[PDB]
Design a protein around this nucleic acid. Structure first.
Ligand SMILES: Nc1ncnc2c1ncn2[C@@H]1O[C@H](CO)[C@@H](O)[C@H]1O
Length: 341
RNA sequence: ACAAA
């Protein structure tokens, strides 16, 4: 079987996620060693563990080393079959990153797959769920992927208790993505939420973001959501609707962090992503990699990151040569699929 | 205050 070195490049959880997803899709067994070497708390966390267990269910796999703290995992898949997914991470572990592991596998399963996942919806160092549903899925629709991601209940660090449900359809009609430069920003949209917190938190995040985005000279409409869960939390995502794809920026609240700073951060992130004039923001750039191998096409990104380069390396470890990358890490770049599988 | 990566 193939062995993937989890200390390579970015050295994070994405190496593990992409590996197990591609093992599940291709049927090739995989061993990942040095899991999350380049992270403060190496080895599997609950998020990774439950992602692995769900893929294990879908592919009826044999798994070795699947425990919290493990730096090594062996994943030997059998047949990929559509089954209903139900996952309780048990912590504030990232639902969106669990979905990042699952999505590529679920859409290759030949029948619709429904999922329900509990954990964190809006937690550090991961996509907020509103980013995944409004930016990532929007781009995925363009290559023929159809599904739905619904937030039933928010969950924040540390208690979690968030609930997300949805489904994807089998990816039967694949279409290439061509996303180079945008020529027009049509408008800015967003969702500012606050959970178990005063409603002015959501309103102030939105107002501060709007302030920073006035310079773009386009309409701005940021919806506010007041909700309840088992603990306090807040967050905001904003995105630019362009003539091509949506680019996003986002930020999270925490105790003592002013709502205004939250909103300002998310807006400034969006502004940074727009500056180069490329269609794909730096987060989506890395998230699209496993899908582009099968869809073909070309994306120009605002910034080539180590995440993106590491994801390419994992994908090519399984599928062979796929991509040509024009540009350096930390700068805008161009990623062409020069061989579709 | 390592339930978040
Ligand atoms: N703030 C964020 N917004 C959107 N995606 C994010 C954010 N932070 C991390 N990610 C994504 O989460 C993963 C990090 O392992 C990558 O896919 C990265 O793009």
């Amino acid at each position: 079987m193939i062995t993937i070195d989890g200390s390579y490049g970015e050295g994070g959880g994405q190496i593990l996620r992409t590996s197990v997803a591609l093992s599940t899709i291709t049927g090739e067994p995989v061993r990942i060693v040095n899991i999350r070497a380049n992270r403060p708390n190496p080895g599997l966390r609950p998020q990774h563990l439950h992602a692995i267990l769900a893929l294990k269910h879908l592919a009826n796999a044999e798994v070795k080393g699947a425990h919290v703290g493990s730096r090594e995992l062996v994943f030997i898949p059998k047949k990929l079959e559509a089954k209903e997914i139900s996952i309780d991470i048990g912590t504030a572990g990232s639902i969106t990153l669990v979905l990042q592991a699952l999505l590529p596998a679920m859409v290759f399963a030949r029948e619709k797959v429904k999922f329900r996942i509990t954990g964190g919806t809006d937690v550090s160092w991961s996509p907020p769920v509103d980013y995944l549903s409004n930016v990532t899925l929007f781009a995925l629709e363009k290559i023929g992927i159809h599904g739905e991601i619904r937030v039933i209940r928010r969950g924040h660090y540390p208690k979690g208790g968030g609930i997300v449900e949805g489904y994807v359809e089998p990816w039967n009609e694949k279409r290439e993505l061509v996303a180079k430069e945008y020529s027009r920003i049509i408008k800015i949209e967003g969702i500012s939420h606050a959970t178990n917190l005063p409603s002015h938190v959501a309103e102030r995040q939105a107002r501060a973001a709007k302030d920073e985005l006035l310079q773009l000279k386009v309409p701005i409409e940021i919806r506010t959501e007041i909700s309840r869960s088992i603990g306090p939390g807040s967050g905001i995502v904003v995105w630019a609707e362009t003539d091509c794809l949506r680019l996003g920026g986002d930020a999270l609240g925490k105790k003592g962090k002013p709502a205004e700073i939250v909103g300002k951060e998310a807006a400034q992130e969006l502004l940074d992503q727009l500056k180069p004039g490329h269609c794909v923001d730096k987060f989506l750039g890395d998230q699209l990699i496993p899908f582009l191998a099968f869809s073909g096409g070309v994306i120009w990104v605002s910034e080539i990151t180590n995440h993106l380069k590491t994801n390419i390396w994992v994908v090519e470890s399984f599928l062979g040569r796929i991509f040509d990358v024009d540009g350096n890490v930390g700068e805008p770049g161009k990623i062409r699929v020069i061989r579709r599988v």
